[PDB]
Amino acid sequence: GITGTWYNQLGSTFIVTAGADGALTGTYIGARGNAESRYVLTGRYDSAPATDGSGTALGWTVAWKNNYRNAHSATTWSGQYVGGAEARINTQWLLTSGTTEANAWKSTLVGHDTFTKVKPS
Amino acid sequence: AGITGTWYNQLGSTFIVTAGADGALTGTYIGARGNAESRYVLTGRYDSAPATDGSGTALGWTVAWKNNYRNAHSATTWSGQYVGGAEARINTQWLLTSGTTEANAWKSTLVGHDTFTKVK
């Protein structure tokens, strides 16, 4: 159920393939939607989740470098997929930028994203 | 890039990673017990062309806590930066999310921090 095209509340697109061995691979596309807004993602997920009605834990990372630009940063999303009627992936994320030693205090941003298979507006 | 090799945290865990030319990080995380039942795959990404002003190298990686011997139904992601030099280190913040029912989603995610060095 994980495999497919997902959208967060801001309109970014998360294209993912969930492998039999627990790998996640795919592409993250920022809201703008152009070639320059595409980035590689990789992660892992629980390929044998519990059958007690719990979600499937997963995580992934995007380094914000592609052939057109480099933001010297990476974001990791940690969350769970919840299947059923309106499937969704609920996450919290950490965005860390490379910084000097003196500026390490503004290195990491924290936030939350909810992904659905329906794109919002 | 400086990152490839073995890294240790202060709690006694080990991770062996290979940094690829294209930005990939692949490896194994080994919890403190050190046996085969404590080994787990890791994958992530890193800035393969960092700034040259002395800034660190941004990176992140994920471990899903399932191997062929056990399943903790959770995944941790580490988000951080590599700092090169004689006393190299990887400074991270981590999120550990456990699979929960919707009612228990409030206790799904722990946050903490870890520092990794090349020497134990």
Next chain:
Amino acid sequence: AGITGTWYNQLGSTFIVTAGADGALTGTYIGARGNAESRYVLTGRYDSAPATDGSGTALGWTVAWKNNYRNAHSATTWSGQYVGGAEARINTQWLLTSGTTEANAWKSTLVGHDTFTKVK
């Protein structure tokens, strides 16, 4: 001013706060049960001179989960911003820290988010 009053989250909790002219926040946080045993003191601070250009008003508060009836040996801090207008909201991220032994410190802190509104 716009912050003083009663706020509700989606899970059924309520918090009543007075925003003082000196940047103080004081009030009560009431759990879903709505019981005398579900009421806890809250105290925090907010920016009493915010930008007037559409920007939110930064604020934070803390609840320690002890009252005269129960004690959960924990404390939550909410950090976020108030956004005024017809659809006024307080958007927060929170940290819940439980008292633990040194060894169990890895599970001391849960992280989450809450959106509060003036209407339930």
Next chain:
Amino acid sequence: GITGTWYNQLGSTFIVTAGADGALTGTYIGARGNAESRYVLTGRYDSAPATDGSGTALGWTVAWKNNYRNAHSATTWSGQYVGGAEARINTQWLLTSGTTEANAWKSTLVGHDTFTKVK
């Protein structure tokens, strides 16, 4: 125990008083140490902690406005006090800055501080 003068790894000073009512009141003094860098803090703590060796949970907030300046943000620290020889307060913090709705996604920084009674 909690009441006292505490210092973080970076040079800041946290003067706090823990009241019988679970209140934390005090002053945060930034690294500079001048009058313009003093800010009010308020928070709460578990005034009846477990006796099994567990720490004492607490939290506090500073809004970064004083009589001299305003940074349009606030920081909350969440953590626990661990007493004994080498008493420490271990925390994680969230710093939120007032932003427009479009920039909200980047409004909160996260980090960690350890406080000791020795500078």
Next chain:
Amino acid sequence: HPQFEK
């Protein structure tokens, strides 16, 4: 936990 009590 009281923050999440139903």
Next chain:
Amino acid sequence: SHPQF
């Protein structure tokens, strides 16, 4: 202006 947003 970060690409995630």
Next chain:
Amino acid sequence: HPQFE
């Protein structure tokens, strides 16, 4: 948990 065991 395996991360801290």
Next chain:
Amino acid sequence: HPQFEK
């Protein structure tokens, strides 16, 4: 920012 001023 004040929290980190040298």
